[PDB]
Amino acid sequence: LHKEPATLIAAIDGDTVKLMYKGQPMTFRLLLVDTPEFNEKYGPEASAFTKKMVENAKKIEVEFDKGQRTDKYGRGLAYIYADGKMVNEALERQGLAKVAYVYKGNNTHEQLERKAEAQAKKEKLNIWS
Ligand SMILES: Cc1cn([C@H]2C[C@H](OP(=O)(O)O)[C@@H](COP(=O)(O)O)O2)c(=O)[nH]c1=O
Numbered sequence: 316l317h318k319e320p321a322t323l324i325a326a327i328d329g330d331t332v333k334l335m336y337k338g339q340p341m342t343f344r345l346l347l348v349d350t351p352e353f354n355e356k357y358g359p360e361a362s363a364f365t366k367k368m369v370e371n372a373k374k375i376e377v378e379f380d381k382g383q384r385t386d387k388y389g390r391g392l393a394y395i396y397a398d399g400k401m402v403n404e405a406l407e408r409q410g411l412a413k414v415a416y417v418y419k420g421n422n423t424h425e426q427l428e429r430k431a432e433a434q435a436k437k438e439k440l441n442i443w444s
């Protein structure tokens with residue numbers, strides 16, 4: 316896989332963000348994770364965590380997997396990096412998302428995510444508390 320440039324347009328919630336990619340505004344949905352909706356327990360914390368991570372970054376990058384790049388809603392499907400740190404993995408490591416929506420051929424980083432989730436679960440963090 317490879318990283319491509321993007322710039323933040325607006326944080327949306329724990330697992331979605333508006334980026335400009337190849338000069339076009341797009342909503343991106345993070346691969347392999349499920350954050351609680353804003354109305355749900357840990358939803359506000361998930362949204363705040365992802366907001367702070369993308370707003371604080373000097374450099375946002377997008378990394379598509381090998382399969383589908385857009386979902387049925389037109390959202391891009393990617394791993395998102397803030398100054399080289401993967402947002403998808405960080406949400407797992409903090410107990411603010413569950414590994415979810417793992418479709419064959421778009422799951423390059425599954426085991427990295429599950430590892431992070433196991434560590435969060437060990438620590439009883441957030442969703443696992
Ligand atoms: C993460 C992801 C979600 N989706 C679709 C499945 C779900 O469809 P339904 O809307 O029919 O449930 C929806 C969940 O996204 P959200 O968790 O953003 O709601 O997005 C994909 O198709 N591919 C993906 O890789």
Ligand SMILES: [Ca+2]
Binds near residue numbers: 330351
């Ligand atoms: Ca969600």
